[PDB]
A and B are shown apart, each in its own frame.
Chain A
Amino acid sequence: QLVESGGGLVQPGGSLRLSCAAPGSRRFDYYTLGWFRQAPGKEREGVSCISTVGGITNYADSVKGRFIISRDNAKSTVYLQMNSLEPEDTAVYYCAAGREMCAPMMLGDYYDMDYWGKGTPVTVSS
């Protein structure tokens, strides 16, 4: 699989940084990365994605200007830097890899992914 690391309890106005890694000598470079989230009352939704060659990034409408996604395929890792967290950002975060190109209005679709992770939870306290 893929493996997610990070996650925890923060306070409003804090910050956090999650990482996803591929154990072994696997390279994960054909196409490989996007970040998703799920909350208790609602349905899963894509949060952001990054592209194979250029370094072209897309975010959803509700997280623009706060989250930042980045890639590093020398050591097979991907990073998500979350800032200015708020009590409605509390959820479980996942990591996925598929084949379709990186574009807007591709974020929300998660029925066509090849590999999924297992989750890491983030709680924003008061």
Chain B
Amino acid sequence: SEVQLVESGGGLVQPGGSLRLSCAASGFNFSYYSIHWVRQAPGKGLEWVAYISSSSSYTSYADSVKGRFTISADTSKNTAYLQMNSLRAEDTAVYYCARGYQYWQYHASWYWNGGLDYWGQGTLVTVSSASTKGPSVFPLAPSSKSTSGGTAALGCLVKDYFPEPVTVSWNSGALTSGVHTFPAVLQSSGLYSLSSVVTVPSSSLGTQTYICNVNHKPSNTKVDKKVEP
């Protein structure tokens, strides 16, 4: 048998709510090992959250979650549960569950440091107070000030969409050389925006028609825009 760990329960919750994540294990003897919960925020490094063995008397939390989270296990069905209470906007992250060694506190020392063997795959937890909405599209129009040595640049701008993602194409997939799409940026308001740019020869602006094509799945919208001086 191969070792597998699968998480479940991720999604969107408004501030002040609560969630329950579940990690389910398959392939080993559940009561010789411990289960660790780790998280990573969008654009930062790894951070450890919590710990449980089998007997529910070996549990531990980190300083920034103490008094809010609660971990528990169920050895008949081989599952671990994390209960998240009183969430805040800074809890938006991807969460993984990993396999420990049960007695890592008792024989951690000067010369040991056991490790974490097998990892899950992650569930995304979003904490926000917005409402689904469609993006607004505008053109970034070329001009002589946008021209550089016979090379011009142009693009399109997408604003105020929730949630991610969106997709942007040019001439319905025709032009696919020199296209830059930037990662999404979160304004203070609560919505995302981005822009996409392309470069062309200066002369080609008189012969070709360029279209920015925006598709947004969650609100089921498509927009087409023409870009010209």
A touches B (Cβ under 8 A): yes
Asked if residues A8 and B117 are in contact (CB atoms below 8 Å), the reply is no
Of the candidates B32, B109, B114, the one whose C-beta lies within 8 Å of that of A44 is: B32
User: With an 8 A cutoff between CB atoms, is A106 at the interface?
Assistant: no
**Contact flags B91-130 to A (C-beta < 8 A → 1, else 0):** 0000000000101001101011011010000000000000
Residue in A closest to B32 when the chains form the complex, CB atoms: A44
User: With an 8 A cutoff between CB atoms, is B138 at the interface?
Assistant: no
Asked if residues B111 and A40 are in contact (CB atoms below 8 Å), the reply is no
User: With an 8 A cutoff between CB atoms, is A92 at the interface?
Assistant: yes
| Chain A 23-73 interface residues, beta-carbon cutoff 8 Å to B | 40-41, 43-44
User: With an 8 A cutoff between CB atoms, is A83 at the interface?
Assistant: no
Give 22 pairs: A residue, B residue, CB < 8 Å, sorted on A: A8-B111, A9-B111, A40-B114, A40-B115, A40-B117, A41-B117, A43-B28, A44-B32, A92-B101, A92-B107, A118-B103, A118-B106, A118-B107, A119-B103, A119-B106, A119-B107, A120-B107, A121-B107, A121-B109, A121-B111, A123-B111, A123-B112
- On chain B, the number of residues with a Cβ less than 8 Å from chain A's Cβ atoms is 12
Q: How many A-B residue pairs have CB under 8 A?
A: 23
B residues apposed to A, CB below 8 Å: 28, 32, 101, 103, 106-107, 109, 111-112, 114-115, 117
Q: How far is the CA of A92 from the CA of B113 in the complex (A)?
A: 12
3 tightest CB-CB pairs across the interface, nearest first?
A9-B111, A121-B112, A40-B115
Contacting residues, chain A, for B109 (C-beta < 8 A): 121
Q: How far is the CA of A118 from the CA of B106 in the complex (A)?
A: 8
- If A9-B111, A40-B115, A43-B28 are given as contacts, then 12 extra A-B residue pairs at C-beta distance below 8 Å, sorted by A number, are A8-B111, A40-B117, A44-B32, A92-B101, A118-B103, A118-B107, A119-B103, A119-B106, A121-B107, A121-B111, A121-B112, A123-B111
B6–chain A nearest beta-carbon distance, Å: 20
A43–chain B nearest beta-carbon distance, Å: 7
B98–chain A nearest beta-carbon distance, Å: 12
